[PDB]
Amino acid sequence: SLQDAEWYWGREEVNEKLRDTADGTFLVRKMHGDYTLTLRKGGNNKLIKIDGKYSDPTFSSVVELINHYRNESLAQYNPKVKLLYPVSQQDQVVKEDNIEAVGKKLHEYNTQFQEKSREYDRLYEEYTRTSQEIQMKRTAIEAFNETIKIFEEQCQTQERYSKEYIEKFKREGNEKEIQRIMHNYDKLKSRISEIIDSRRRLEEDLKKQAAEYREIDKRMNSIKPDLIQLRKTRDQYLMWLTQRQKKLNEWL
Amino acid sequence: SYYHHHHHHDYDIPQGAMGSMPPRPSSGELWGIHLMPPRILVECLLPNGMIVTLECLREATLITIKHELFKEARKYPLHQLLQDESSYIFVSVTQEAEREEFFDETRRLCDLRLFQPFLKVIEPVGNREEKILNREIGFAIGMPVCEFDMVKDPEVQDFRRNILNVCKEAVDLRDLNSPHSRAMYVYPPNVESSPELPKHIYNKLDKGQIIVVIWVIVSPNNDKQKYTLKINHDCVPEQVIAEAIRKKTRSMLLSSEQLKLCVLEYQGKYILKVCGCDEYFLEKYPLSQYKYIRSCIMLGRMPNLMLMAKESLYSQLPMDCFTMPSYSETSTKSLWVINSALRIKILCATYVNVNIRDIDKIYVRTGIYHGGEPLCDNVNTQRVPCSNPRWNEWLNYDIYIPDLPRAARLCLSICSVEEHCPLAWGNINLFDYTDTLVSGKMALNLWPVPHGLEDLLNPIGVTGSNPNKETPCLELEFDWFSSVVKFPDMSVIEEHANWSVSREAGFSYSHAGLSNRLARDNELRENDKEQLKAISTRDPLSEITEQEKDFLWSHRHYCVTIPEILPKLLLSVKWNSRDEVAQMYCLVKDWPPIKPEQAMELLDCNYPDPMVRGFAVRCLEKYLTDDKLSQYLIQLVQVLKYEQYLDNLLVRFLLKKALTNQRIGHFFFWHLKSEMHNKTVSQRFGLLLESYCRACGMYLKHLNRQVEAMEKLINLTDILKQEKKDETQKVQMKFLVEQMRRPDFMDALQGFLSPLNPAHQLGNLRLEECRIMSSAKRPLWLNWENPDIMSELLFQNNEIIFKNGDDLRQDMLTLQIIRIMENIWQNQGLDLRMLPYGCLSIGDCVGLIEVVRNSHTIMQIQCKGGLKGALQFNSHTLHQWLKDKNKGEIYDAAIDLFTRSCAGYCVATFILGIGDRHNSNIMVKDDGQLFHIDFGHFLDHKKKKFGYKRERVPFVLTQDFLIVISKGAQECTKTREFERFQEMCYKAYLAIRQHANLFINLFSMMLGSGMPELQSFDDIAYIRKTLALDKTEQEALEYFMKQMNDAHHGGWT
């Protein structure tokens, strides 16, 4: 029973069992002392150290000491929470006492998991490209707008000088002068028209991009929670077995 | 029967197939097109309002285009309204959306980075032409300097103005004993840290001497003359210059006395070059202490220096000429007065992208942090879930406002529902850069959850809002206290500590939870003074228990006797007790300085306090040599990410060193420049690079050329990888060469410095030897003429691989780690020859790798020495191939090299857990040295699927190796040759284990970078198991053997 204990395992693989459990969860474990109560508190793991007795204050065993503190908080021993979650995997593995078929399930889930992790990786690249493609679209839009200003300024710039050079000399040249001045001006203004149409066409593309971007995040967020549970089940199935370390790798 | 006739209905076959080349995209010469058409139309907007459209060549200078434009404008109307062309400049909108004036008219149309092909003509405004070579700066930087000027944020504006303190100081150190000190900046002496010599180096010298070759030139600039000295290893450049001049000027027409007088007038006119590259010996170190010499000694080479006129050197250094840029509440209410708890109002997230089918409900998780958390983590209620989420509730944190430490940070995250799962995240500094506790309303645009993080909250992640607008923006509101609350002065904190100390001295006889206070007196117990140093020796990842914490805290004053404990002590302080923290501030104020390798831990994410991080920087300022800095420069640039504010001490340290030593400066630029795409650091690194670029002198113009070269190669490969995919090598290679022959590429890719090493110049391109390798990433093999005077004496050709496509920074780090393992081994006498070939990321999956000449992948060895028919390759062929190279006594030495390198690369590899080794990623040089390439993922990142105590052996020595190792026997397992080998591996394994603190800390400091292999400290924790740090060293040896045995199946006991 002190070997079994429903949580006595006997550093790194503690933390990867304490990874993503709640505020309260715990377990028990080099000439430092003996066993170590690794209790998790809000994303950070707190390690508490342990003639018969198991710092200053009569508890006759390791199981004696932890049952007391499952009821009670740890503030009275050391100033700054309870041992509420004694989390330690026969509950939902199809209860399979078929040693081989639990090993096959591990592969099925691990192929699903590894399938799923690629889908999540692919999409994260699409997301990040799409951010970059979007901000490149945005900058271009400013570039366009700034381009347009220079041409809007240019068509304005000539109106000042061209219509100084119509009135000063109306008879001289006349429709030889002012035709071939007007031609240029009508190039300049429909050119502006093409540019503005080019910008518009990018903005419509930007929205369709920003929409696709939204759709990628959406599906990332719908893949994520499955990727956790599919992962977490695999680690419980793989824990139940080790209750053949080299046999695992072909399934995995 | 194969598939039970089960149909996959969705599956349809109209980048898994051809699984290579992932990172994109990048636009080149004109908007939306990589390379502009060879002949192109540009509208020129004239000052008379006319548009004349020239057809120009792609490659044409603006001088040519202006000259033609003002010919061609004549034919259009209103010509008499134009000035002489010399009264004008070209302007246009670029791809960065700024209107650049084109001052340098020798620039070519393709090189301007135009957005649209058009050019407006103007008379030059901003009459300081000089000043508007900020274009130079934002070329080198890759974003225009005008983009900083319109940042509202006062912190930024404050960084820019206040950082100039540092620049002006460094520029002063340069022009101090000029011209010598300018030369000293530009050409700082490339030198080992220790003047002491390892045993095995010394013993190549016959009683401490070296034959050397000094070379000289007389008239015109052709004939050269050797002067083959045999000086003492530990004699300085000035002494060596004498002996060259002595022998040069001995004569039958000069007496002995007459010679001595002709020496002295000559002796200090000259300085020593390294023939073949721009390295120099400008200060009194032992010759042996310069790296070139010590290399020459190890490689069995006669050093080839050059006698160089100081004036022909001081000729080449132009003046640096620094210029200051254009950009030059009544005592408030102390934090300790505020009598309340912290509460933060969450309000409303806007832009949350969730399937309402898939996800039930969503909330905002929160916490206060300092690396770790100073209170119970709390969420809010699961309200208005998914559809338009809005909570207008004050979150209530059990911590008093005065117990918030200076470096306190809020960390929050929107989550989904034990269905718990993060959507977004973002953190805020509770104090601003002016020490001001944060109050009022805040907009915080959030980050997406990265790969490795399944956790809910992510507090190591960067402080600040995401610059990307279209992302989950969760706005919120901080309490207001009718006053700008501010963090206490040090004077004020000192007093509170001096008081808290006295107050402990009157606490009485009994205290349950002695824990936090001694109750010992000045006499401590000897069993405990032993338990403390015991703690101190442990690595950073051997987490400390609450007993040990309280214990360390109680004996904090004895901990000053053992300075090296500080990292541990600091992590035992309760940062939520200003009583405890204030006292720690007084310790750290005059805590004994420690070794840089130990102080560097204190700039990782677990030590965010300014005072701590100060101490660290003060350690570096004392001990850390310009040598040892540039080794660890990668980790120090990374570690900036964990600084709370733009302006800080670490930034001011590095920036200064960079402006003091052009060799640091060089890599400092590139490492920052590298990460400029990454928006976590864009602003910060941009701002910094602007400082450096503004103050670094002529090197800016050199950098700008290196930068222009890389951009061309980035474009060239981007085309090869898109639209010239699905073409034969033949067609691609024809495209490559066609392009490299165009004058713009010829201009841009020829006269410059290798970014891998700016000592090497790159001259003309030998295109006959330039080629695209067979990889699907389409890397370029480029080759340059070494345009040194003494090319021949070093290498006539310089070749480096440019690779657009792979993230070079994992490799870069493993190679750096190897660099360090070699050094550790060698400098503690034992010779294992690693070959950390050069690597450098200069971009987002863009980089440069050093070519090692005369080396081959085992696979080539076997493909070459492989008999016809193709039944099986022979294990002996490696050995036969190696025999074929090294014949006679030379053979015996080549096997010692193979054996020495193979043991180093066995241990390094096993420890690091790099990708499985095989014939196409292991290489052997003609002289018999072995070295790995393309390491893959470094800390066992393929254990992220399955994994679990795999503790793999990536270098498994097949027969091939074993044959060679035991000269040529059969049953190689049973030779002294192999006994010797094994004992190298065991001495190497233990050597790295004794420096394991460092290696943890180098990895700890690299968590910053978004490397998927380094997401959190558990990643780094592999290196614990492999080094077996929890065990004793005698167990560790046995562990390592056990591991080495089972992967080989027999041999190791």
Ligand SMILES: O=C1CCCc2cc(O)ccc21
């Ligand atoms: O290409 C140039 C321009 C002038 C200065 C210079 C000095 C060198 O040592 C080598 C090359 C060069």
Ligand SMILES: O=C(O)c1ccccc1O
């Ligand atoms: O997660 C932890 O174990 C931890 C706890 C406190 C401080 C730093 C840490 O990495």
Ligand SMILES: [Cl-]
């Ligand atoms: Cl480097």
Ligand SMILES: [Cl-]
């Ligand atoms: Cl190589």
